[PDB]
Design a binder for this molecule. Structure first.
Ligand SMILES: O=C(Nc1ccc([N+](=O)[O-])cc1)C1CC1
Ligand SMILES: O=C(Nc1ccc([N+](=O)[O-])cc1)C1CC1
Lengths: 469, 469
């Protein structure tokens, strides 16, 4: 069973001894610190609140277990047993903490307060930053949602330019990252964040997370279709690739089907196998059940373009109203190797240059989508900005001489709409002057209870692109 | 509760329909594919086997849930209910799978077989690659362990060169990554992998993982010391940084204590606060309880060197037997910002150039240690190499025309010692010719049981540096 007393950075165990004496309040905030990725999607806090922070999270057994571990870990007795005892006795083990946050799904420019944390009982001044470690891991669903949305923007721009609309946009980037992330839990969280922006996923863990913690009106938030892997092609033997292809498209003759085509020679597979030997099984397929040819190696741009050129000469191509070339509806292509935000951009720009509509292609992304991201990317960061000592509130901050980018905000914070409709974070408790509208942060957690929740449907709505609006 | 029927990539749900008819065996293998990082530490499979794969992993309820989810996910009924029911009924839900693996902790050159997987019941031919996704997540602990060991190699070389010994090596790279990883589960796995090589960690989650799945003779596998963070310094107020320092080092006067010193002006803190105002509290400390000064911003190399030059002029410096400068034993430095394998190398080399012993410094690493890694780094990969169809075994492989680096191995594999004492992987069942002695892989999982296991102490022993040996 999870033990919040063992879910912090070791050194925080010692911090209760280091704050100024007579400190009754410690107030901290999270931002994606300023100084590409100019705005971030706030998503994932609700998962953390519900899974780890709510309810009776302190018990006698958990305190003793923590005491036992820390004794050995530090080779010394430092550990605030009395402080944790207090929470257990006075609050039945519920955390005397208040968290206020911008609504999930909201898209906020860098350098704004996204949530704040403070103790609600003076005895628990040390608790605010105890939970920094667990709360800061919200960086991951924020960053996955944000990077996924930025890719959607690229896809939308090029799809609109080359086709004149956005049909199918929400299926143009599929999550292939299940095997490529660091754990089962990470897979579920990351997959859920991608689904804020798209509907295609193979990372099944995401579905159950959304249902349990957020919820959708639809049965599931994400979808997939039958597809081959190299094992299901290569198992037929090197000389029987055609047989494998035929068996697979025939098994799935009435649904869309993706077939990896690069086991031996992608260009041969497209020109001679699909384009000649098995052409009769492709041209007969429904518009709702195309063959999706999947290259999986080589330079992503070069391979995509060469695959399109080969297919364009074996299959009947039209030119759409924008002047771009379009494969017949029963045939499409997906590139799912080496795709990240950089290579996605290069591929669609290259296609546009060669007069191929983005209607022709879809993408899959694995490591690039769910693993190749860090907390540094959006500078997701949690800092103390206000304390009360001897009954006096003081505005606190860091401001390292050698790195102005690491300066933190001062005092009590609030998030507001500007007169032009943008966002501003007010410092030093200036929000109390009420010269702006209402504070956009809402209490989402107080004293062990989740106080405000969002469905996944609401989150999707909040994270919509402008071009969709 | 975890459901293995829901812990695979979506498309694999459809693979049982795609293999050649009458396939009785699918045999697959995992390697860190060839073409820095010339050898990898094999670590983490044992966690996966015990947490996810062993015992009764299939129930009537789990089957029904998966069926209901996939119906919606695919908008069709393609889920192999009968296949999963067979396992439930025939094997009381235990997986008829045999896995053979190299010993955990082993250090093996790239491009060798590390583990193999095959079904033990011909009806379960589809099961081998169903569990690809979960087994391939072993990439993460392998890669963290490997990259952590590569950093140890660097620290060893320079510590040995500048000091004449390796005293304290195992505490020279501390895990600061808890907040910077993508999940709680990832934190535990990654921290455990770092502890294969070092003994310093703040990622508490790693301790319980090791205790449950591996075990040590010692009470805990990793340790920490009291340390400040920006909040426990800045909470005192901008004008009271000296007061914060004095309070903290007085509270922790008889144990080592690390104090972040860059909240406002690192160079001032070193020269004026530590070096003058509070000097009397530092020079009085025990060799067993040094002050560890922690810069945390600026160019890592430039800041480390300037911090050392400052301290060297305020405190009594000696010259060790190797001719390098050494701070007094009550004073040390730790760099814990922007440390990864590249910058670690730059710092120790720059210190050597400026005649500072590596005895003076330790490192902390967070994102660089536990998060900024992908499956692509060591090319961790799982592929089918052998199948039996209509009673005939065939050697199978991929070999993409555009990327020779993605060619996979053929047929039944085994791992052997060469006449010179190195590793070789034999393909095509050639291990059976018995010209290369015994297979070095061991059966670690068979039919729902873990059949061979390693303590964390054994793993540490296997992973030692040659220089330590
Ligand atoms: O293509 C699909 N899934 C999939 C493909 C490749 C990987 N991978 O890891 O390379 C993982 C999953 C289905 C949407 C059609
Ligand atoms: O320095 C320590 N812990 C620690 C410091 C900084 C971070 N961080 O994330 O920045 C995390 C943990 C203790 C070993 C003394």
């Amino acid at each position: 069973e999870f033990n919040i007393l063992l879910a912090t950075d070791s050194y925080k165990v010692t911090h209760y001894k280091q704050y100024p004496p007579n400190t009754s309040k410690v107030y901290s905030y999270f931002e994606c610190r300023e100084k590409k990725y100019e705005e971030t999607v706030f998503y994932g806090l609700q998962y953390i609140l519900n899974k780890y922070l709510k309810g009776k999270v302190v018990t006698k057994e958990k305190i003793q277990e923590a005491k036992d571990v820390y004794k050995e870990h530090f080779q010394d007795d430092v550990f605030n047993e009395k402080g944790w005892n207090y929470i257990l006795e006075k609050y039945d083990g519920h955390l005397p903490i208040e968290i206020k946050a911008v609504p999930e799904g909201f898209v906020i420019p860098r350098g704004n307060v996204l949530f704040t944390v403070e103790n609600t009982d003076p005895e628990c001044y040390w608790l605010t930053n105890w939970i920094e470690t667990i709360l800061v891991q919200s960086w991951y669903p924020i960053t996955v949602a944000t990077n996924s949305r930025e890719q959607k923007k690229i896809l939308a721009k090029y799809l609109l330019e080359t086709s004149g609309n956005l049909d199918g946009l929400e299926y143009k980037l599929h999550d292939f990252g299940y095997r490529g992330v660091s754990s089962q839990e990470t897979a579920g969280i990351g997959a859920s964040a991608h689904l804020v922006n798209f509907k295609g996923t193979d990372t099944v863990a995401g579905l159950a997370l959304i249902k349990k913690y957020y919820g959708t009106k639809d049965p599931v938030p994400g979808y997939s279709v039958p597809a081959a892997e190299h094992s299901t092609i290569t198992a037929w033997g090197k000389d029987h690739e055609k047989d494998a292809f035929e068996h697979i498209v025939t098994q799935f003759s009435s649904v869309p089907v993706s077939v990896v085509s690069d086991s031996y020679d992608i260009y041969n597979a497209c020109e001679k196998i699909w384009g000649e030997d098995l052409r009769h099984l492709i041209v007969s397929r429904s518009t709702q059940a195309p063959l999706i040819i999947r290259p999986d190696s080589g330079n992503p741009l070069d391979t995509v373009l060469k695959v399109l050129e080969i297919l364009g000469k074996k299959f009947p191509v039209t030119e759409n109203s924008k002047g771009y070339k379009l494969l017949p509806p029963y045939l499409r292509v997906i590139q799912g190797d080496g795709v990240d935000i950089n290579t996605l951009q290069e591929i669609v720009e290259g296609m546009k240059q060669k007069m191929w509509s983005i209607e022709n292609i879809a993408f899959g992304s694995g490591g690039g989508l769910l693993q190749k991201l860090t907390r540094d990317l959006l500078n997701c960061s949690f800092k103390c900005s206000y304390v009360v000592t001897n009954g006096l509130g003081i505005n606190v901050f860091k401001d390292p001489v050698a790195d102005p980018n690491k300066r933190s905000k001062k005092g009590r914070l609030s998030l507001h709409r500007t007169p032009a409709g943008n966002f501003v974070t007010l410092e030093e408790g200036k929000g109390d002057l009420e010269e702006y509208g209402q504070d956009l942060l809402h209490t989402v957690f107080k004293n062990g209870k989740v106080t405000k929740s969002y469905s996944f449907d609401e989150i999707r709505k909040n994270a919509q692109l402008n071009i969709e609006l």
